Design a protein around this ligand. Structure first.
Ligand code: ADP
Lengths: 48, 34, 29, 237
């Protein structure tokens, strides 16, 4: 699944939820560095 | 594969206006091309 | 005479292209 | 390459000989980068090799272009252009033309203008050009000034807002043909005029003609009822 959301304040609340119910997750706000986006996309492909 | 897409929206609050303006735009946005 | 500045500038060229190789490969990840 | 991509190539090649700019407005998921890359992949004419290309794009996309050039066209060589001022300054030495193409972000091209003005770029690929939609924008005002043969826009789901943005995008594509927003107050009375104006430069696909092997999107709207704490606050507002 992809979850899209429209407030950085909310993506923080979603991250607190993803940590509590132990789903595994990965986030890419506009505040992420350009180099992080590369690794993070390449890890969402290539893995179960 | 399949693709499924979900919107989560509240009854009667304000998010309905957003959805209405989105719907209004969506058909205009077709006819000006095809 | 001229060989000193020539071979210096040649060394600067391989120095530049080594930095080009490195800072291009910084784009991998 | 797929059939619609090859028809795209013949169309772009016609526009290239004719000296015409336009929008490659295919629906997302059909290979708009792959089509633009094919302006190099089959390009035996060599003209497109020994002078530099610009790809200008929104920030997250800078990665895929590098992988797509390196996988489809190992014939070419590609320059990054983002990150530290030091790395930018260093890379400016290498393009002080075996630097066949440069990959760039809108937020840098609107600042390093002085450096981009120094060289005669052959073509600009303005990826996801819906970024340029407002003529009030510095981005639009500045990106008009760079000199090249063609300006190529690869934006899917284009236009689709208000007629000020239509004029802005179309006048970015052609500096002639359009003078003001007043023409676009006179341009099925409205629709047919716009269709005929767009037809010589504005390809389309629509997913259902080509994505025949994909499932259709099952789209759910799920209504939710807000909680007691939400009622109290919503009422107080
Ligand atoms: N001919 C092709 N061969 C391989 N992959 C292709 C081809 N055409 C399209 N693709 C794939 O489809 C996607 C195309 O993405 P992109 O170029 O951004 O097109 P679009 O803008 O339509 O989404 C990529 O995953 C790419 O690998």
């Amino acid at each position: 699944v992809l979850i899209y959301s429209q407030m950085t304040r909310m993506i923080d609340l979603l991250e607190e939820y993803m940590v509590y119910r132990k789903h595994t997750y990965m986030r890419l706000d506009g505040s992420s560095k350009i180099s992080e986006r590369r690794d993070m996309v390449a890890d969402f492909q290539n893995r179960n | 594969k399949q693709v499924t897409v979900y919107r989560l929206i509240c009854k009667g609050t304000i998010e309905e206006r957003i959805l209405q303006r989105a719907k209004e735009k969506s058909e205009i946005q077709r006819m000006v091309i095809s | 005479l001229t060989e000193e500045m020539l071979l210096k500038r040649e060394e600067r060229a391989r120095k530049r292209r080594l930095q080009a190789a490195r800072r291009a490969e910084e784009h991998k990840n | 390459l797929k059939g619609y991509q090859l028809k795209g190539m013949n169309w772009l090649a016609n526009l290239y000989e004719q000296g015409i700019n336009g929008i490659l407005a295919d629906e997302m998921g059909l290979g708009k980068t792959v089509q633009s890359i094919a302006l190099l992949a089959h390009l035996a004419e060599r003209e497109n090799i020994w002078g530099p290309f610009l790809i200008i794009s929104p920030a997250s996309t800078l990665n895929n272009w590098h992988q797509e050039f390196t996988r489809f066209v190992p014939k070419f060589k590609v320059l990054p252009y983002w990150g530290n001022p030091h790395d930018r300054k260093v890379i400016r030495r290498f393009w002080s033309a075996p630097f066949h193409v440069v990959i760039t972000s809108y937020q840098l091209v609107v600042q390093d203008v002085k450096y981009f003005q120094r060289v005669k770029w052959q073509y600009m690929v303005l990826d996801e050009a819906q970024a340029l939609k407002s003529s009030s924008s510095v981005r639009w005002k500045i990106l008009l000034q760079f000199q090249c043969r063609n300006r190529l826009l690869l934006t899917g789901t284009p236009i689709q807002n208000t007629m000020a943005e239509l004029w802005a995008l179309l006048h970015f594509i052609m500096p002639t043909l359009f003078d003001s927003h007043e023409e676009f107050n006179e341009w099925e009375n409205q629709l047919s005029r716009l269709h005929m104006i767009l037809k010589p430069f504005m390809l389309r696909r629509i997913k259902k003609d080509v994505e025949n092997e994909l499932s259709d999107k099952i789209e759910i709207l799920m209504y939710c009822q807000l909680t007691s704490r939400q009622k109290l606050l919503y009422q107080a507002l």
